[PDB]
Amino acid sequence: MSAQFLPSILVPLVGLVFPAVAMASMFLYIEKEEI
Amino acid sequence: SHTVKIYDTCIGCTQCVRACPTDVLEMVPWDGCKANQIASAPRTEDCVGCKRCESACPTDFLSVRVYLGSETTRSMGLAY
Amino acid sequence: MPIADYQVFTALFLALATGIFAVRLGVALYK
Amino acid sequence: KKVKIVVDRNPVATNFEKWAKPGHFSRTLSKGPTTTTWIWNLHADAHDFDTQTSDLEEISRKVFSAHFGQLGIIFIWLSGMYFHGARFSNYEAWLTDPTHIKPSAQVVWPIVGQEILNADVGGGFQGLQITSGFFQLWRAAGITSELQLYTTAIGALVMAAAMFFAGWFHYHKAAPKLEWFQNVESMLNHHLGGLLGLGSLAWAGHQIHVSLPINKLLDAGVDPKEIPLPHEFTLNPELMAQLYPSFSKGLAPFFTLDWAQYSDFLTFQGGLNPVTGGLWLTDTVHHHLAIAVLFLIAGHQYRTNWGIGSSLKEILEAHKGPFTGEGHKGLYEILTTSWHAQLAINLALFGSLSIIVAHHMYAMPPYPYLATDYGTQLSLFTHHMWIGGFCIVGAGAHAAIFMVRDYDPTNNYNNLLDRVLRHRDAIISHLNWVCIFLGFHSFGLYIHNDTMSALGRPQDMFSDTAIQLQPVFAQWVQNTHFLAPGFTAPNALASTSPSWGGDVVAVGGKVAMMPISLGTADFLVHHIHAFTIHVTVLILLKGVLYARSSRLIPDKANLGFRFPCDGPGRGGTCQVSAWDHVFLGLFWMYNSISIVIFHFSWKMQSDVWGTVSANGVSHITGGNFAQSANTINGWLRDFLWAQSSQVIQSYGSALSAYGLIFLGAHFVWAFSLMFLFSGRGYWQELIESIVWAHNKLKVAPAIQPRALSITQGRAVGVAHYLLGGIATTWSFFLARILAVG
Amino acid sequence: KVQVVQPVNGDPFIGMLETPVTSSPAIAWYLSNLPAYRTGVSPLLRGVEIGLAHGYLLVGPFIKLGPLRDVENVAEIVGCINGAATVLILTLCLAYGAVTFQGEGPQVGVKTLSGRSIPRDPLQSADGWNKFTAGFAVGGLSGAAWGYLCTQILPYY
Amino acid sequence: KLFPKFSQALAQDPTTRRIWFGIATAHDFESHDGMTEERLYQKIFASHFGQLAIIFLWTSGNLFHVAWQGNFEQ
Amino acid sequence: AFTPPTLQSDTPSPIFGGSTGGLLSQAQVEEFHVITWESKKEQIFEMPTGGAAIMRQGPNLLKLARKEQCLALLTQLRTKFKIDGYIYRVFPNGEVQYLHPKDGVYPEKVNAGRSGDNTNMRRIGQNKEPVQIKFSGKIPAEF
Amino acid sequence: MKDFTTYLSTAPVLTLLSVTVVAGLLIEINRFFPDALIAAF
Amino acid sequence: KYGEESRYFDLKDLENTVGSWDMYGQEDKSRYNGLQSEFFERAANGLSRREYILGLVAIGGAGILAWGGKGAADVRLPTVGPQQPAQVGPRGRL
Ligand code: CLA
Ligand code: CLA
Ligand code: CLA
Ligand code: CLA
Ligand SMILES: CCCCCCCCCCCCCCCC(=O)OC[C@H](COP(=O)(O)OC[C@@H](O)CO)OC(=O)CCCCCCCCCCCCCCC
Ligand code: SF4
Ligand code: SF4
């Protein structure tokens, strides 16, 4: 496939960075007291 | 905080009041039944929703109804 | 003729723009 | 004061007046069957004597008579077993060839092609292969002939009639008073020595004068029809001396304290008999004599009508320490006035004993030609395991019942029960944590192995080849037992069981017993067993400890022991009673026992049972347990899928019945799901529509049909779930073992 | 005649009991001398100590059980793994601090077992948790770094 | 404790249920606080547009993955 | 002529050895309840939190978490020892609010002078249809 | 005697006796007329 | 609480009647050495702000991407390594 390096960067981004960021943001938002 | 309602079909048997485990209902004077008393729910904030009052009502249909609504620290029966 | 790397990069950029439009629609729906 | 026989004359009249009035025992069942719920309530409270009356004397009398009736039923069952073994069996032929003829004691009639179930067991006989082990028991007892079995069956019928008469006599003629039942000291003294001790001594006597000579001749090789009759050995010291020379001296050595002379028939060898594959009958005789003496001595500790003896109340009240405040005070009053507490203790120890029996019986086969009978071994082990599990769950249920009805705070102040009830939160929280830790470190290991195997990384698994989890403690104990003879047991010629190690004991070309090596798979399965047992204990203990009150419901005791809930308030109180805790504990017990029996079956088929061909041992499954039991996929494929081919291919043969039940059980189990995932409202409304249809045609019944109560729905669901699962395992086990054993 | 189990601070209507496991003199001293129970010590220093200990004890597991445990470069890979774990539990501490401390309220006072009034732990504050979280990062990363050095040094190992 | 922006009653729940029910009742626009018929229809219309865009993106992703790492030509 | 009786802090508590089912951290930041009764003798009773306590001869005070626990204890005292008690609600700030015997007369007995709160003058089936009150944060029972 | 006959007339006793009689009749029908796949008259 | 006898309730000392005790806390400012404490508080100077401390966590996110694009290949991960031959399939397929 063209640009074999792309999956090695996108898979961890969508499975590790994006989920951690999304969970942290959701946790901080669902307990804001004043949204 | 559940919604407790009393209807004119009540006969004033006072069974629902005795069956309440959180003291939510009480008997007040009335003139629509032979007992000359009607049930009331002045402290609905303390109602947990056990529906014990409905299991004791002998009228058909029930004269006392509990509609579960927004849950609070008291309605959920939480001691922690 | 397999797709080249530049094509993948262009597709990813267009997807980024589409995602921006999607987040804008989501924000509008939240309001 | 003073233990005596106190009885009331003619308390209940004998007539059929109450037989025509169903529901006479209950006061709430007097308004008649207005709805169908009355019919179910009639059976759900038939044996709940605590509700039928408030007098403890009447309850005790009812329990005594019920016990007599149960004894009569058991005697009828025993009589049927002996009669079938004497008229519809091949026991006589099996005696001449116990290694090739398969025991059979049931014959079916030819009605709708079912005669195919009459298998060719052997000895010119056709019937159903039995796995109860009655043939081995009878052989160990020296039955030899079928006339003796018929005589035993008739005697059992007479005993059943005597038991029923005893129950009727003690309930309608001479009913014991309450003070008679509360004689725990006298009851224990009689049950220890007069029952267990005397029974063991009598059995030892029979074994000495009947089992030893007949079995010795059978083992040496003599036709069963040529062996002398039991009375010819019991009343003739000359022949018995010909078989056992120590008998030429009579009873003189016993009274002169020169017991060594009796070493020929009172040995302490060990291991198993190489001819029959079972324990040495002389060793069993010595064991029974020793335990009989021990029990007889133990039956003299409690005080009765004389000064000598100990007092249960005095001993209990004297055991108090700094960590338990008052101690065991009040326990005597609880165990002498509450039948449920005694039932709980007895059921717990009784079930534990049944489990111990299953273990000791497969480890050390006590009957001749029993170890080589793989079907009988597996059947006995599984049956006793299930009985033990059920009894334990019942023990928890009755403990909760006592805590709900017979508990009295004024009598249990600062004692063991009160202190336990005052810190139930800590107990439950710690048990919950240990259950979670065990579940993780036990099941997650299997999941990790599955993931590694699927990812192509077998070197990262928890196996004997990669990360090893050797059970060093179990292996050490096993080797210690193997080295016990001549060291920590000088008078022992061999170990208790060949499983500890040593040579292979094979009978008739089949392995009767051999060392059982423990590896990583054994470690994993043992931790799985510990985890399941802990979860079951957590459920039962939580129900017993919170049966009275809880933070959610402070007056749970007022609602009773068996109630569906406390409404949808507080988020939901569904299944909050103790009965519901027992309902869930039943499922967890089923899961635990199922895993236990699966482990036993696979381990014996892969590392014990097999054939000897002068070149090694050819196990049934080839030893795939040590390399596949570390993953769930291995259990599903190498055990469930591989061993199920025997039951799914039994159609058209004698084992076809096992193939039918195997499916039928699968149905019942699934049927249970209907009652487990549903509610009462849906069925009540559906019944309303059906009732309208009936009313439209003037065929509506007066006994208003009602949906099963919430508690009844749960009971039906759990009963069907366990029946289906247990029957499925039963059919699978029996078909597999009867086709490859 | 001695009763080693007493109600918590003599009050028998509080969901707690005093046992030789909770009220033991040595156990109480050791538990009270931990960095978490230091009302008078700066939260940053306590966080540094906690992070150092946790980061150091967190290398071992991956060293002897990681996917690359059978390779000479296992120590480095594990040092990085512990650093990642420390950073993860770091963001966990930050999220907990941002959610827990976001408002103020006239809370009830705090006293000792004897009845001596003491101020609330500064760690239970918006700025107190932030300082504690920052110290945990420096200490946690340092502990993981020291874990790799110990592998290279330590003549026995 | 005010995440269920569409349900003021759920926001007052001090238990974890507030979060649970806060996600299971997000699409029940008719039961949200201060909801009218016009706003309900407009929200549904916009949600339909979002769903259509999601379907188009899914199809585009399938095509892109087949053309990038597949063997369609072979 | 009834006035809510004030809560005396000098009332001794029943003899109890302690338990893990007592007050937690909710009573420090939310609220708790107090039940005070009068006993004619020192006797053993069952506590709603588990275990057995001994009520002294005279005034007794017991602090619990939920109001249901206090009411359950009161029910036990009324149906077992024929003892009448009073329940109060205490907040962390220090406010005491009278509860259960609101007007000195038990709720099961009519007192003539109470509030007839939540009492509809219709039948259960005479409520408004759910479609007639759509787009309104109210149930048919509140009309 | 009246009470005994009344007990024998109860729903469970009558149900078991009726089921036993029906099962016995069917078993004997299949014993004397076996393998009746169709109604050959 | 004024628990001088059997009274565990006190409105004037309601703080002690709700079990609000530290149990193990102890205030003491004499422990960590001044020279070592200064070093650590100095190292974690500006890292006490939510935005700045999150930045340190963001570095971990960059390391994750760095591992996939470089770290995974340097540890010779099987997924980033090569492949050997292949199979045909059940029938005449590929
Ligand atoms: C819904 C369609 C869809 C789906 C299910 C997938 C799924 C996948 N993609 Mg892909 N992708 C898509 C669309 C999709 N893609 C489109 C339209 C493009 C063109 C720009 C790409 C370009 C792309 C590349 C370059 C790569 C992947 C890769 C992957 C694989 C790993 C995911 C990853 O980390 O990459 C990240 C994916 C992206 C950065 C772009 C995807 C954006 C889509 C459209 C978001 C859709 C969100 C959805 C509609 C809303 C659902 C809600 C949900 C988020 C909770 C994975 C199997 C990687 C791979 O090949 O693995 C070996 C890889 O390197 N995709
Ligand atoms: C013909 C003899 C006879 C007669 C006329 C009576 C008559 C009476 N008995 Mg009695 N009893 C008898 C024998 C008799 N009994 C025997 C032998 C025992 C010892 C077990 C008892 C023990 C006994 C007790 C403990 C009690 C009575 C009671 C009673 C009175 C009402 C209960 C009743 O009978 O309901 C009807 C009972 C039945 C119709 C049968 C009961 C169910 C049987 C035993 C089940 C057998 C199991 C069977 C194998 C099926 C299980 C498996 C199956 C699923 C295949 C009644 C006047 C009760 C009483 O006094 O009322 C307060 C009382 O509690 N009896
Ligand atoms: C040496 C005296 C003796 C013996 C042998 C027994 C034996 C037995 N008792 Mg018993 N008991 C005794 C003394 C004795 N008891 C005394 C002194 C008291 C008063 C404190 C009691 C009070 C008592 C109660 C309350 C109960 C028993 C029960 C039982 C049976 C338990 C069933 C079992 O698992 O055993 C195995 C079963 C057998 C071995 C069946 C064979 C039965 C033979 C005939 C033994 C009969 C022994 C008997 C005492 C002989 C005297 C009776 C005579 C007047 C005809 C069992 C047969 C329980 C029971 O099931 O009720 C029947 C039960 O509920 N006992
Ligand atoms: C010595 C053993 C023993 C004894 C004497 C008792 C005695 C008692 N139990 Mg108990 N129990 C036991 C063991 C025992 N139990 C065990 C082992 C368990 C675990 C399963 C339980 C769990 C249990 C519960 C949960 C409850 C009791 C209850 C009771 C009381 C009322 C029983 C009753 O009349 O209900 C009626 C009896 C029946 C309806 C018999 C039905 C038999 C089952 C449902 C059918 C099973 C099928 C069978 C295996 C055959 C299948 C073939 C089929 C296809 C035909 C009673 C005093 C009840 C109670 O309220 O206590 C006060 C209560 O709810 N028990
Ligand atoms: C693997 C062992 C299998 C058992 C599981 C152990 C886990 C259970 C842990 C729960 C502990 C709860 C504490 C209760 C606290 C408690 O009960 O109060 C303390 C208790 C009370 O004793 P008293 O002084 O009151 O004694 C007066 C008594 O007569 C009245 O109870 O004394 C004990 O210490 C009991 C021992 C508990 C510890 C049991 C462990 C025993 C070790 C056995 C080791 C076996 C293997 C090694 C052999 C070589
Ligand atoms: S639902 Fe329960 S708490 Fe509410 S009024 Fe009825 S009985 Fe009282
Ligand atoms: S139970 Fe029903 S009839 Fe009786 S007082 Fe209450 S509402 Fe009226």
Nearest atom of ligand 7 to the alpha carbon of B62: 2
Tell whether residue F74 is among the known ligand binding residues: no
Rounded CA-CA distance D681/D236 in Å is 76
Helices D374-405 and D520-545: crossing angle in degrees, nearest 10, is 30
The answer to whether the CB atoms of I75 and E77 lie below 8 A apart is yes
- Give E13's contacts in chain G (Cβ within 8 Å): 13, 16, 18, 22-23, 62-64
Instruction: Determine the residue among E6, E111, E121 to mutate to test chain I binding: the one whose Cβ has the most chain I Cβ atoms within 10 Å.
Output: E111
The answer to whether the CB atoms of H34 and D22 lie below 8 A apart is no
Minimum distance, in Å, between the CA of residue G101 and any CA atom of chain B: 9
Do the two chains A and F touch, given a threshold of 8 Å on CB pairs and at least 3 pairs? yes
* CB-CB contact of D271 with D498 (8 Å): yes
Give yes or no for residue F59 CB within 6 A of ligand 1. Answer: no
Exposed e or buried b for every residue in D537-554, given b needs 16+ CB within 10 A?
A: bbbbbbbbbbbbbbbbbb
Q: Of the bound ligands, which one is closest to the alpha carbon of residue D671?
A: 4
The answer to whether the CB atoms of G48 and D554 lie below 8 A apart is yes
Which of B40, B43, B50, B63 is the pocket-test mutation for ligand 6 (most atoms within 8 Å of CB)? B50
DSSP character at residue G90: E
Nearest chain E alpha carbon to I5: E10
Rounded CA-CA distance I92/I94 in Å is 7
Strand partners, G46: G52
What is the 3 state secondary structure string of chain F? CCCCCCCHHHHCCCCCHHHHHHHHCCCCHHHCCCCCHHHHHHHHHHHHHHHHHHHHHHHHHHHHHHHHHCCCCC
The answer to whether the CB atoms of F3 and A34 lie below 8 A apart is no
Which distant-in-sequence residues (6+ apart) come within 8 Å of D567 by Cβ?
B49, B50, B51, B52, D573
Beta strands in D516-614 (DSSP E): 610-612
CA-based angle D267:D368:D95, to the nearest 5?
130
Domain extents in chain B: 1-80
G17 touches chain F (CB under 8 A): no
Q: Of the bound ligands, which one is closest to the alpha carbon of residue D46?
A: 4
Domain extents in chain G: 1-143
Give yes or no for residue D584 CB within 6 A of ligand 4. Answer: no
Which of B14, B16, B24, B72 is the pocket-test mutation for ligand 6 (most atoms within 8 Å of CB)? B24
C16 touches chain A (CB under 8 A): no
F17 touches chain B (CB under 8 A): yes
Residue G29, Cβ neighbours under 10 Å: how many?
A: 12
HSE (side-chain half, CA atoms, 13 Å) at D493: 10
* CB-CB contact of E85 with E58 (8 Å): yes
CA-based angle D640:D641:D646, to the nearest 5?
95
Exposed e or buried b for every residue in A3-23, given b needs 16+ CB within 10 A?
A: beebebbeebeeebbeebeee
Minimum distance, in Å, between the CA of residue G142 and any CA atom of chain B: 8
Rounded CA-CA distance G58/G77 in Å is 14
Rounded CA-CA distance D363/D516 in Å is 10
* CB-CB contact of D617 with D511 (8 Å): yes
The answer to whether the CB atoms of G134 and F30 lie below 8 A apart is yes
Q: Which domains does chain E have, with CATH numbers?
A: 6-152 (1.20.1240.10)
Rounded CA-CA distance D242/E64 in Å is 70
Residue written as token pair 């409304």: D685
Nearest CA to ligand 1 atom 54: A14
HSE (side-chain half, CA atoms, 13 Å) at D385: 26
DSSP codes joined into one string, D219-270? HH---TTTSPPHHHHHS-HHHHHHH-GGGGGTTHHHHTT-GGGGGGTS----
CA-based angle I50:I55:I59, to the nearest 5?
150
Could you tell me what percentage of chain C is helix, strand and coil, using 3-state DSSP and rounding each to the nearest 5? 85, 0, 15
Token pair of D376, please?
């009988």
- Give A28's contacts in chain E (Cβ within 8 Å): 95, 98-99
Nearest atom of ligand 7 to the alpha carbon of B12: 5
Residue written as token pair 């599990």: D389
A21 touches chain I (CB under 8 A): yes
Minimum distance, in Å, between the CA of residue E110 and any CA atom of chain G: 10
Q: CA torsion, points D217, D221, D222, D224, in degrees to nearest 10?
A: 80
Rounded CA-CA distance D233/D211 in Å is 10
Nearest chain D alpha carbon to B78: D552
F36 touches chain G (CB under 8 A): yes
Cα distances (angstroms) measured from residue D547 to each of D345, D403, D407, F72, G54: 17, 7, 11, 67, 22
Give yes or no for residue D181 CB within 6 A of ligand 2. Answer: no
Residue D45, Cβ neighbours under 10 Å: how many?
A: 17
* CB-CB contact of D7 with D175 (8 Å): yes
D502 touches chain E (CB under 8 A): no
Token pair of E37, please?
């129970």
Q: Phi first, then psi: what are they for D711, rounded to 5°?
A: -65, -40
Which distant-in-sequence residues (6+ apart) come within 8 Å of G120 by Cβ?
B5, B6, B7, B8, G141
In 3D space, the residue among G101, G72, G87, G107 whose CA is nearest the CA of residue B18 turns out to be: G107
Rounded CA-CA distance D433/E70 in Å is 34
- Give D326's contacts in chain E (Cβ within 8 Å): none
Which of B7, B9, B15 is the pocket-test mutation for ligand 7 (most atoms within 8 Å of CB)? B15
Sign of CA dihedral D274, D280, D282, D283: positive
* CB-CB contact of E129 with E100 (8 Å): yes
In 3D space, the residue among D438, I60, D336, D385 whose CA is nearest the CA of residue E87 turns out to be: I60
Rounded CA-CA distance D106/D172 in Å is 39
Minimum distance, in Å, between the CA of residue F14 and any CA atom of chain C: 24
* CB-CB contact of D608 with D513 (8 Å): yes
Minimum distance, in Å, between the CA of residue B54 and any CA atom of chain D: 10
Q: How far is the CA of D416 from the centre of ligand 4 (A)?
A: 29
Give yes or no for residue D713 CB within 6 A of ligand 4. Answer: no
Which amino acid is present at D129?
Q
**3-state DSSP assignment of residue I23:** coil
Minimum distance, in Å, between the CA of residue F44 and any CA atom of chain G: 16
CA terminus-to-terminus distance, chain B: 18
Rounded CA-CA distance D689/D334 in Å is 51
C3 touches chain A (CB under 8 A): yes
Token pair of D110, please?
């030819």
My answer on whether omega of the bond before B61 falls inside 30° of 0, hence cis, is yes
For I1-94, where are the alpha helices, taking DSSP H only? Answer: 34-43, 50-66, 72-74
The answer to whether the CB atoms of D16 and H3 lie below 8 A apart is yes
Give yes or no for residue C29 CB within 6 A of ligand 1. Answer: no
